[PDB]
Design a protein around this ligand. Structure first.
Ligand SMILES: [Mg+2]
Ligand SMILES: [Mg+2]
Ligand SMILES: [Mg+2]
Ligand SMILES: [Mg+2]
Ligand SMILES: [Mg+2]
Ligand SMILES: [Mg+2]
Ligand SMILES: [Mg+2]
Ligand SMILES: [Mg+2]
Ligand SMILES: [Mg+2]
Lengths: 151, 113, 261
RNA sequence: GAAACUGCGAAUGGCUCAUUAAAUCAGUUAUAGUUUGUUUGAUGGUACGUGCUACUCGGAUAACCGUAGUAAUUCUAGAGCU
RNA sequence: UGAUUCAUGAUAACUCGACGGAUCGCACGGCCUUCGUGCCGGCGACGCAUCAUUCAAAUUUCUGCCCUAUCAACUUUCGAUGGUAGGAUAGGGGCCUACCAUGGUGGUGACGGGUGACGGAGAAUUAGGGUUCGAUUCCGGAGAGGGAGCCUGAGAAACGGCUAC
């Protein structure tokens, strides 16, 4: 419903709200990472290419890539990964979270889109210190092996 | 009219101190304050600094008249600073103390960032 | 349990650590080190309890991370280091050497040494056998390993290890007729010259020993530790020359001590 | 120097005795029938070059900035640095 | 070595190789080859792999436990005892599979049943012999409301971790 607009080219972001069916029949039924042209998103987005990427809803449960069903399905995730960054969770833990599907549909709240088109000396010491002691290792060999060999 | 003697005395220049078990005898006297013992120990060891002394664990044996305890004479106040438990310094007033309240000493604060 | 046990409560701490019963719940729990943690003595028990150079846990921590303490000739910051038999502790601030030796009662003493009799240590060999590319090597009971060992050195023998060239300087062939200093069991501490060694197929081979003043005992091959070839040991024995004496005689010696005082 | 990323620990302690009668456990064996962070000691050729003494340096990422969902909680999406 | 086709070496190859350092600190200091932080080189930290060691564990051998026969037969299709071949495991092993054999235990008490039964060191009473007890702070085991299944990790079938009922 409510659009987040951000551009990487300038670095600026802001949020607006739309409520028009014939404006968003083209917004629906699309997945994460699909381009949308701003022609029809509103007469003052022409040329602007919006990218549907992200998007969470009311009850605050996000959309996840790869799950394609306009439901709120429960998934077992891994910490740090998409739609699961639980902190203080003893690495290797998994939780069964609630997520939305990846094809945008009616019951969301906030849809995120982005804009594609606007219409030393110490090291010098250490390298040869390593070379020095690795070569004294082999000199120590060629002493202390033959010392025993001669017997 | 009190006396003052030490025993079990050993000097370890590891922790740069001279450590003893003193065996004070104060017949008639109720007891002797540690402060009151400071000047006597200082003037019998000429430690050049009556603050290098830290004496404790006094008993006053059953029947009265004789008390024991430990004593620590440092040779640089620098070493007295560094090799000392935090509370004998506070007893001699060389440092001050603070108090705790441990609600979100760490618990609630482990939640936000 | 589900993993290593890292606390050792005070009453489980072995008998020869001499530490008292009511001083607290726990005991220093020697770290996994060069000595078997049942036949050891941690550095805290060395500093605090015996030498009294410190009076608490933290004070020994201060002693050790001043970098003052030395084991086998190299400084050691650990505080539950499992020192063992004939480990040398030097304190160069005090120019003072100890070599950690048993007494006849089975407890550790700190027998002092000079520098010439501190430059080296002494330990037996667990086993000599091959390694990578066919080079022989031996493994001691001290953890130490030696490569290219003197091809005469066998298992059960004893070696001296200088703390600068860090290799053999000599080795004593474990044999009848040279002195030992048993390091486990009831006979631990008692020095004495082997008179016999009997082997049994499939189990422990025992050594019969005599205290140079007559008394005779036996112990299996595990706890013998030959010191010197012949009667003369190559290490300065403690105050009582490794003779365990009856409790009656420990009474007579104290009577004779008081009657001349 | 706070915060955060990376590392380690959280498998110890602590409480209780529900289960369980050759079983757990005790003395004593065994591993040549095995795994072991670490501590301690030793150890370390050639990566291609047609073995003729080595031939060059990547973004993305937390904390931070900014923009949000939710009633919500160490619940959560996206943009921008390193 | 009591005992090994042992340790270990050599050789033929094999592997989409984990590995064989693109890491971090103070202390400055001999001397020009182009006098160029110049040729240098030490003391440490952290780390990677093999062996040994240490802290351990796991499996394990003999012997040892209370009352009950109104508990004299129990186990065996579906592992019960063994053999082989193999899989799985860190590893032995019916731990599992395929095939073959029909075995194993039992009046010296199997199997089952009771326990207001975790085992032990030990506690009370004790002339000797014994009788009763042992939840409990030391050791070993087990368990996290009941079960079951797992990830991270050297180590957990972990609950001051998760997944399901
Ligand atoms: Mg426990
Ligand atoms: Mg420790
Ligand atoms: Mg098999
Ligand atoms: Mg019960
Ligand atoms: Mg217990
Ligand atoms: Mg409950
Ligand atoms: Mg458990
Ligand atoms: Mg569990
Ligand atoms: Mg709890």
């Amino acid at each position: 419903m409510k659009l987040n607009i951000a551009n990487p080219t300038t670095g600026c972001q802001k949020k607006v709200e739309i409520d028009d069916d014939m404006k968003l029949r083209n917004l629906y039924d699309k997945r994460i990472s699909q381009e949308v042209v701003g022609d029809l998103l509103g007469e003052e987005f022409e040329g602007y290419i919006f990218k549907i990427m992200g998007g969470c809803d009311k009850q605050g449960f996000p959309m996840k890539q790869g799950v394609l069903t306009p439901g709120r399905v429960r998934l077992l995730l891994h910490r740090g990964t998409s739609c699961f960054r639980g902190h203080g969770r003893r690495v290797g833990e998994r939780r069964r979270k609630s997520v939305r599907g990846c094809i945008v549909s009616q019951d969301l709240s906030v849809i995120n889109l982005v804009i594609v088109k606007k219409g030393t000396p110490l090291t010098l010491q250490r390298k040869r210190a390593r070379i020095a002691d690795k070569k004294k290792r082999i000199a120590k060999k060629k002493s202390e092996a033959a010392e025993y060999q001669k017997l | 009219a009190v006396t003052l003697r030490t025993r079990k005395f050993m000097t370890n220049r590891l922790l740069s101190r001279k450590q003893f078990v003193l065996e004070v005898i104060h017949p008639g006297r109720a007891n002797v304050s540690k402060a009151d013992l400071k000047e006597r120990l200082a003037k019998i060891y000429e430690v050049k600094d009556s603050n290098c002394i830290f004496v404790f664990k006094f008993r006053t044996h059953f029947g009265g008249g004789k008390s024991t305890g430990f004593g620590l004479i440092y040779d640089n106040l620098e070493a007295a600073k560094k090799f000392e438990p935090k509370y004998r310094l506070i007893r001699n007033g060389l440092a001050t103390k603070v108090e705790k309240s441990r609600k979100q000493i760490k618990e609630r604060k482990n939640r936000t960032k | 349990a589900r993993g290593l046990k890292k606390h050792l409560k005070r009453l489980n701490a072995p008998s020869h650590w001499m530490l008292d019963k009511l001083g607290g719940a726990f005991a220093p729990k020697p770290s996994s080190g060069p000595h078997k943690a049942r036949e050891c003595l941690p550095l805290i028990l060395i500093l605090r309890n015996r030498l009294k150079y410190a009076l608490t846990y933290r004070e020994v921590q201060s002693i050790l991370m001043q970098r003052h303490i030395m084991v086998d000739g190299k400084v050691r910051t650990d505080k539950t280091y499992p020192a063992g038999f004939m480990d040398i502790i030097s304190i160069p601030k005090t120019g003072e050497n100890y070599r950690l030796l048993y007494d006849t009662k089975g407890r550790f003493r700190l027998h002092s040494v000079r520098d010439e009799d501190a430059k080296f240590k002494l330990c037996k060999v667990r086993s000599v056998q091959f390694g990578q590319k066919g080079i022989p090597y031996l493994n001691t009971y001290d953890g130490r390993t030696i490569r290219y060992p003197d091809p005469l050195i066998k298992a059960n023998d004893t070696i001296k290890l200088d703390l600068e060239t860090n290799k053999i300087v000599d080795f004593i062939k474990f044999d009848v007729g040279n002195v030992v200093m048993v390091t486990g069991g009831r006979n631990t501490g008692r020095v004495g010259v082997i008179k016999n060694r009997e082997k049994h197929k499939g189990t422990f081979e025992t050594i019969h020993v005599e205290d140079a003043q007559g008394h005779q005992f036996a112990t299996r091959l595990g706890n013998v530790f030959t010191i010197g070839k012949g009667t003369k040991p190559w290490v300065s024995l403690p105050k009582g020359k490794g003779i365990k004496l009856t409790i009656i005689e420990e009474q007579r010696k104290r009577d004779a001590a008081a009657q001349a005082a």
